[PDB]
Each structure stands twice: as C-alpha cells, then as structure tokens.
C-alpha cells in the first residue's frame, strides 16, 4: 500500500527542522546484510541535510530498555528487520492518542512470516508494502475480515464453524518456518533508483548484502543474476580502459572460485579449504592428502616472486586450472568451483572482489576488542560492531588487512576442533536428527558470540553433505564456557547438493514455542534470532525427550 517514493517525501517533511526533531533508526548487529543496508541510507540523509541518531541493539529482550524509557518528541522512529514474527504492538503497548497519528514508525522487515495486524489495521505501523509480495496471503480477505465483527441457533452455529474454518487457515498460517525471501539491499536500492542518484559506491554497496546470503540460501540471488548484470552495464563509466587514473574506481567482471581469498593471499592456506571442497566430495583428510598432491605441489610456492607468481602469472595457472577443469568437466562434473562472481578495483592497491570481502567483515565483527558477566559480555559486541561500520572508507587500509590476517587463522582455529569432534565420533543419529554435545574441548571462548556458531554448523552441515538418500535432517549442537550452563543451543538447515524443490525452511521454531510454553523452568529466548535459544543443564535431557516424540515436520 506504500508506494516507495511517497514514504520518502512523507518522512522528509515530518522531521526536517534545525532543532531536536530527531528521528532515530535502530539496527541489529547480528547480521551482515542488516549493516550495509543502513549505511547507504545514512549518507543520503547527510546530503539531504537532516539530523539523526543511530543506535545498535543486539538483543530482542533489550528493545524495551532502549526505546520504552527514553522518548521526548521523537516522531519518526525507524527500524530494520525485527518484528516479522512477534507483534511489537502487543510487545509494547501504545495507546491510540491523537486517525492521523502523532508518532509513526516504519519497518523494513525482511522475513517470510508476516503479521496480519501490521499490514491490515495499520495506524502507527506504516510497513513497507509495495510490489514486494502481491500475494500477501491472498485468501485472507474473509478470515480476519469476518473475525473483526464475528432461529439464529442454527444460523450462528454455522457462522461459528466458518470462523472455525477461518481459524484453521490462521492455524496452519502463523505456523511456518522462516527465511529471508528478499534482501534489504534489494528494496532500498530500488527506492533510490526511483529517485535516481548515480554513484558507483552505491552499486558497490548494494551488492555486498546480497552476497552475504550466498551461504544461507541458493535461489534468492539466483533471481538477481540479471539485476547484477544490467546495472553494471547501464552505469558503464567508460568504453576504454583510460589507464593510469588513480581514481575513478573502475568496475569489471572476472571469474572466481569457492576456493576463496586467493587474490588477497595464501594459496598455502587454500590447502585447508581446498580440503573443505574435498569435504564436499567424499572425505575430510584421507584420500585428499594424497589426492591434493597431484594438483597442487606441481609448483613449489615461493617467497618473493610469489608476490608475483600467485598474484600475476597464476593467470597462466588460473588459465591452466581453466584448462584443467574443462577436462575435469565432462568427467568430474563438480561445479562448485567455477563461478561468475564480481570484482572491483581502486585504481591501485590491488584487486579486491566481493567474495572474500564479506569474509573479512564477519571475522572482524567477531574479534577486535548476579548477571554480572553478561553485561560485560553484551557491551563487547556492540563495541566491536562499531569498528566494522567505518570499514567502508578508503581511510581504513592498514586495519583492512587486520581482519584478513585474522580470518585465515580463525578457520584454522575452527577446523582444529571440527576434526576433533569427528574423530571422537559423538554424532548419534537417534531417530530424527543427529545430536552432538561438545561437552568440553580446547578453546571454548570462541563460542559465546553466535556468529561463529552458524559457520561451525556451516562446516558441519557439509561433512554430512554426501549422498545420504534418507534422513536429510540437520543437527543441533551444544557448548558451554560460562557459569550456570547457559548453553547457546542452536539448529541448522538441511542442505541441497545443487539439484529448493521441497519447502524446507525450519520445523524447530514451531517446537521452540512448545517447550517454552510448558513450565518456564529457566528457559530463555532473549537472544534475537529464533534459531538460537538457551537451556539449563538438567533441562537439555528432558528437552530431547520432548522432541523425539513431538514430530512436527
């Protein structure tokens, strides 16, 4: 219902004064795509000359202590992706006060399950409803529309069953798993194009966020293979090379690989994550530590000209892999390596693509630093978030490589224990899933912050990415570092070996409502993403007993 140009002009006139008419935006730090959408919105507000206030919020239980206590004349609140599932208007009471209301938020939710009240019956929740979903549960035109108003003994009895007929279609709905169907990069960049501001930095920025979802889903960005192509041609800066210009930020395309961060460095530590790619084939160590030695130590890898040979004349060897894997194409047919990709340059200072670039932003968000420990743990993640947001200037150079050298040990750290829990053989296929409890190993500290955990699962979902022609169910892990057994347990998604036909989002959050509804015996859902909860030590064993019988898939 909200045409994209209209809300911008409408939010322009509501706070454009040179006083404390302050509009304030909110963003989570727990997602990479959540960042990059906000950054481009801020800078146009700079050149439209408006005063602002940016606050990060990491926790879903924290939202009350950051809004509902400190407000004076904020008319224009803005928020990025928080309330697609839980209704905030039930979470936060706002009485109707002063039909042409006095304070209006927007919302930029990116998730699949929506909330019917937030689009229909909108009076303060001006949601982003434009040509996003044209089929916003198109059967709803009589269910709640007759729920609003609700001899007659035989007539109303039928009328209660029609309500009960409406009740089931609101029972199967609001009982679905979640993803993000369309990235928040897609919306606001399309909005700016309706305004029409030509800067390649924007075109460099919007493609970053959709690149982040390349490891969570598949066919979401497969729709955006044209929308990457047309813009880099329509925003063609030049037909010539027009060489030796230190400026101008030229944009091109070049092929690239799952074997990653190569152009930055280390065909050495590729050896690990080449075996990641052979972990996608049939092994983790055994044949490859012979098999890699047909394809790799063919050239001893130098010290000085390796600044030139695996920077420059590896183009003789990328060609050679390009003429190796063309004859590994009709015979091997493993198509996780050749990819189209995208690249940028700075005139000088090396070529940096966007494949490796999202990798540095994840690790640099991680490291780079009763109830008395969680406060001094929660003040960390907001602070180290902040040194990643300013990473989008040229002014950060010698901090850019800091995350780079950080990243190529963290994988060496995370692979150091993944190989341990395999060889321990503590994965047990009980009946439905597989359960693993990392009770204690070395280096437990790097598992408090949840962004590492999805990567550990991302490595662990791919150890079981062999054929497995029955029981394609992901796992649930367990780890503990701190007191009272906090146990940030989480679930994963099943994966496809590039063949989504079946609708596999999640079943656990439906069950996560169930166990949280039972006894409230020290269970917590205070963390933001529903795929992560907490548990007590004496509750994880009756957790699974409630889960091995409650088959909700």
């Amino acid at each position: 219902i909200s045409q994209f140009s209209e809300a911008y002009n409408k939010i322009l006139r509501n706070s454009s004064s040179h006083s404390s008419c302050q509009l304030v935006i909110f963003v989570s730090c727990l997602n990479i795509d959540a960042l990059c959408a906000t950054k481009m919105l801020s800078l146009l507000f700079k050149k439209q000359l408006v005063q602002s206030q940016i606050v990060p919020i990491f926790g879903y239980s924290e939202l009350r202590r950051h809004y509902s206590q400190l407000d004076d004349n904020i008319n224009s609140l803005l928020l990025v992706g928080f309330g697609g599932v839980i209704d905030l208007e039930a979470f936060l009471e706002i009485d109707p006060q002063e039909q042409s209301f006095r304070r209006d938020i927007y919302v930029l939710d990116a998730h699949r399950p929506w909330n019917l009240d937030n689009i229909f019956g909108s009076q303060i929740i001006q949601c982003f409803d434009d040509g996003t979903v044209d089929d916003t549960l198109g059967e709803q035109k009589e269910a709640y529309y007759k729920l609003l108003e609700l001899n007659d003994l035989s007539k109303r009895k039928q009328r209660k069953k029609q309500i009960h007929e409406y009740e089931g279609v609101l029972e199967e709905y609001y009982s679905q798993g979640t993803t993000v169907v369309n990235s928040i990069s897609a919306q606001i960049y399309s909005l700016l194009s309706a305004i029409g501001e030509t800067n390649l930095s924007n075109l460099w920025l919007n493609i970053l966020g959709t690149t982040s979802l390349d490891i969570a889903y598949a066919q979401v960005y497969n729709r955006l293979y044209p929308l990457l192509q047309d813009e880099v041609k329509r925003l063609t800066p030049s037909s010539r090379n027009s060489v030796k210009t230190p400026d101008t930020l030229t944009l091109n395309i070049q092929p690239d690989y799952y074997l990653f961060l190569l152009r930055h460095s280390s065909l050495y530590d590729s050896f690990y994550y080449s075996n990641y790619v052979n972990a996608k084939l049939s092994l983790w160590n055994e044949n490859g530590k012979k098999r890699l030695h047909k394809m790799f130590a063919r050239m001893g890898i130098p010290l000085s000209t390796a600044q030139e040979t695996w920077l420059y004349m590896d183009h003789s060897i990328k060609r050679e892999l390009g003429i190796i894997f063309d004859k590994n194409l009709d015979r091997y047919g493993l198509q996780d390596i050749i990819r189209d990709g995208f690249v940028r340059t700075l005139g000088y200072r090396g070529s940096i693509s966007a494949s490796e670039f999202v990798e540095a932003l994840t690790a640099l968000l991680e490291v780079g630093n009763s109830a008395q420990k969680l406060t001094n743990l929660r003040k960390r993640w907001v602070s180290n978030f902040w040194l990643s947001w300013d990473a989008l200037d040229d002014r950060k150079v010698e901090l850019l490589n800091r995350g780079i050298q950080l990243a190529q040990d963290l994988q060496r750290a995370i692979f150091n224990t993944g190989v341990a829990i395999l060889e321990k053989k503590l994965i047990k296929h009980l009946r439905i899933y597989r359960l693993c409890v990392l009770q204690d190993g070395p280096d437990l500290d790097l598992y408090r912050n949840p962004l590492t955990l999805l990567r550990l699962g991302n490595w662990l979902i791919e150890c079981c990415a062999e054929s497995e022609d029955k029981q394609l169910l992901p796992m649930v892990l367990a780890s503990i570092d701190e007191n009272t057994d906090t146990y940030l347990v989480a679930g994963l998604t099943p994966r496809y070996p590039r063949g989504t036909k079946k609708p596999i989002l999640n079943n656990f959050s439906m069950a996560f409502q169930q166990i949280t509804a039972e006894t409230d015996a020290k269970v917590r859902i205070d963390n933001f993403e529903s795929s992560i909860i907490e548990i007590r030590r004496e509750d994880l064993s009756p957790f699974l007993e409630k889960l091995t019988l409650s088959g909700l898939l």
């Binding site: 140009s5 309706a194 305004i195 029409g196 501001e197 030509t198 192509q229 329509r234 063609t236 037909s239």
Partner: protein, 424 residues
C-alpha cells in the same frame, strides 16, 4: 536523399555503443546498449529541483525531446510514441502513429499543452497532453523542431526545392502563420567528420529559442544567427551577432587550433553557454565537463592587420568599431521587448541604462579619431547617432580641444532640432 532521424543537440554513435539522445538547458538524455536491449538514463544539472531516474528500454526508442514538464519518446520504425511526465499524478499514455511504406518519423517536439509529431512524408499530426487528436495537416517534410510555450518552428526540406522554414503559433482560436516557408540563409557543408555527415545530412548541430522571445539557429557554418522582429514581416531579418572563429582567436593569444570546438547549450541575456570538448572527435563522451561562458563578439576583423600590430590582443581604436555594432543591435531588441511584452525578471532597466551609456561612450572614441585626421564632415554624421542629451554636451568639448569652431555650432543645431520635435 535519405531521411535520417534528427534530434535536438544529438550526437552520433561513432566507434562506441553509447550516445546522447537530446541535450538542453534542463539536462541531457543518453542511452547505454547492453546484451539484449537498450537502457535510457536521464541525468540533470539541477539535482536539487527534479528527481533523477532511469528505466529499461524494451521497445528501443531513438527519438527524444525534453521540456520543463516531461519527456517524450518516439519510434521511427513502428510509429509507437510514449510521453512520461516527471510528476506521479499524471498517468502515462501510449498510442501508435500510422506509417506508410517507407515512411519514417524524423523529428518530434513537446509542449505541456500540445504534442507535435513530424514525419518524412510531411504528415502533421497534433495531439494534446492526454492524446486526443485535433487535426491532421499535409505540409512540407519537417526535419528539425524547437518550441518554447505555444510556438511551432519547423525546418522544411523537400527533395527538389528544399531549404525553408516555417513559424506558427498554436492559439486558442486558430493556428496563425507568421511566416509561410521563407528561405533559410544557413550554409550547407561543401573518421569523425565523415561519420557525422551521414547521420546529420544538413549539418544542424543544435537549435533552441532565446529567453527574450527570438528564435536562434546554429548550423554547420558555426555562426550564431538571431531572428529579430519576428512579429512584423516588414522588418524581420537575421542578425549574425556572434562569430566563433574571432572569439577563439582573440582569447587564446593570436593562434587558431582545430580540436577545440564550441557546442551550444543555452543563451541567457549575456553569454552563450558551452562545453569545451578536447580531442579528435567533435562529439563529447563520458567524463563530466564543467560549463563555460563565452562573451558575445561581432565578427568584424581583418587577418593581415592583426599580425602587423602584434593570446592575440586587439587595440583601443579597432575595438571601438566592434563595440558600436554590438551595442546597436542589443539596444534595439531590448527596447521593443519592454514596450510590447514588459518586464520578465525585474532588472531590465539597469541593463538598458548601462547599455545606452556604453553605446554613446564608444561612439565618442571614433568621433575623437575623426577630428584628429581633420575630417570635419565625417564627424558631423557621427553626432546624429547619439541618443542621450548628455552625450551632445561631451561632443562640444572634444571639438573645442581639436580647434574646430565650425564643428561646435553644428552640434548646437542638432540640439535645437530635437527640442522642437519633443514639444510637438
């Protein structure tokens, strides 16, 4: 003869895949070719007034015209046109113009209340701002169009006779003709230069209307022509008030290059807006050039005399003749504009007072030179061209210093004759 699609201030493709569709004082419209379609990108100079936008071209439009309210597109092969207003209140409309065998649309134009479409066979189809047809007229084939408000200015070129222009006004009662196919004095031309000639057979680089109501044209001969007194056919004539070759030569130092051309953008009462294009091609490419302003100069010079007297510099005595010709044309047009249309900005009186003061001052420099060479008779004719009464008093002091008592009494007879006519 081949009927090529013409656009206002358009540039050809060359060895590239991109070009400029149209170009004016509002902005510029360009197209970028990709793998399967075309992509139209519209950029403006005043970013703070209008919202910049772009869209994909599925049909493949090659004709464009830009005014202060919208953008009009046209297809020469299928006759499909589309008008896109900048405001979201007005809805888009699409209609297909009927075309015969071998008929191609050569020029389009748009005003906020009327739509002008011209073809190669001379069919004149006019629409309103909603698409409702009013009349179908059969005239000469239109090859170039320009419009400000009501007026329709078409350049006609047939197969045998050719080279003519028409001037009309789309009034509320009926269409009135001020000129009925008068001959155009534009000079026709007798690799960058080779490719430009095929796409543009007449050599018309750009054409637009001035801010003071006079039609301007800029042909291949690089001479700015000014049509003065268009409301009266008895005194309607073309005035070449600016010569390209003279302006580049004086500012540079006394030389003349080849790669520095002058593309016209707009003329707003003092200078001609331009883009300095440096290179082999005569058409610009994509960098963002800064707009420049060239001061207006009458093309009256000798070439052998400037080399003997030596950026090339012009002396005092020689510049007085050029200053007299420039001020005489501008003062006559500004006087007729205010007495018929009135003020437009509110500061026309200060411009007129400063121009009339410099006109009488420049004539006194030539008046002083005639007295030094003892030519009393030439000095008598110069005194009659003075407008202000204070200029006649200053002419007496120049005459007394040059020891000519007979010339002094002749100035006083002009003063008594003007006072008698003023009291009648």
């Amino acid at each position: 003869f081949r009927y090529m699609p013409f656009s206002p201030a358009g540039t050809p493709f060359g060895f590239t895949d991109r070009r400029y569709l149209t170009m004016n004082e509002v902005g510029y419209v360009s197209t970028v070719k990709n793998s399967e379609q075309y992509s139209i990108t519209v950029s403006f100079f005043d970013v703070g007034r209008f919202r910049e936008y772009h869209f994909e071209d599925l049909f493949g439009y090659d004709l464009c015209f830009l005014n202060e309210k919208g953008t009009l597109f046209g297809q020469s092969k299928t006759g499909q046109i589309q008008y896109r207003p900048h405001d979201s209140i007005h809805s888009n409309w699409t209609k297909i113009i009927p075309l015969q065998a071998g008929e191609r649309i050569t020029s389009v134009a748009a005003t906020p209340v009327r739509v002008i479409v011209g073809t190669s066979l001379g069919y004149f189809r006019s629409f309103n701002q909603f698409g409702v047809p009013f009349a179908v007229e059969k005239t000469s084939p239109i090859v170039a169009l320009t419009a400000q408000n009501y007026r329709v200015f078409s350049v006609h070129y047939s197969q045998f006779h050719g080279l003519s222009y028409s001037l009309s006004e789309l009034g509320t009662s009926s269409k009135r003709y001020y000129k009925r196919e008068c001959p155009l004095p534009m000079s026709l031309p007798n690799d960058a230069n080779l490719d430009y000639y095929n796409f543009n057979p007449m050599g018309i680089k750009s054409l637009f209307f001035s801010s003071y109501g006079d039609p301007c044209i800029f042909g291949s001969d690089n001479t700015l022509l000014l049509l003065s007194k268009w409301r009266s056919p008895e005194e309607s004539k073309w005035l070449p008030i600016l010569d390209s070759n003279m302006e580049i030569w004086k500012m540079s130092g006394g030389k003349e290059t080849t790669d520095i051309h002058v593309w016209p953008l707009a003329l707003a009462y003092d200078t001609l807006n331009c883009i300095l294009v440096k290179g082999k091609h005569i058409w610009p490419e994509f960098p963002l050039p800064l707009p420049s302003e060239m001061e207006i100069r009458m093309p009256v010079f000798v070439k052998s005399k400037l080399l003997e007297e030596n950026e090339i510099q012009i002396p005092v005595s020689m510049a007085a003749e050029e200053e007299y010709l420039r001020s005489k044309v501008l003062s006559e047009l500004l006087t007729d504009t205010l007495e018929n249309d009135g003020e437009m900005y509110g500061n026309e009186n200060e411009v007129l007072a400063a121009l009339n003061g410099a006109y009488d001052k420049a004539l006194l420099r030539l008046f002083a030179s005639a007295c030094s060479d003892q030519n009393v008779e030439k000095a008598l004719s110069l005194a009659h061209e003075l407008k202000q009464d204070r200029a006649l008093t200053a002419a007496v002091k120049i005459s007394e210093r040059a020891e000519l008592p007979s010339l002094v009494k002749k100035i006083n007879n002009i003063r008594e004759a003007r006072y008698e006519q003023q009291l009648k």
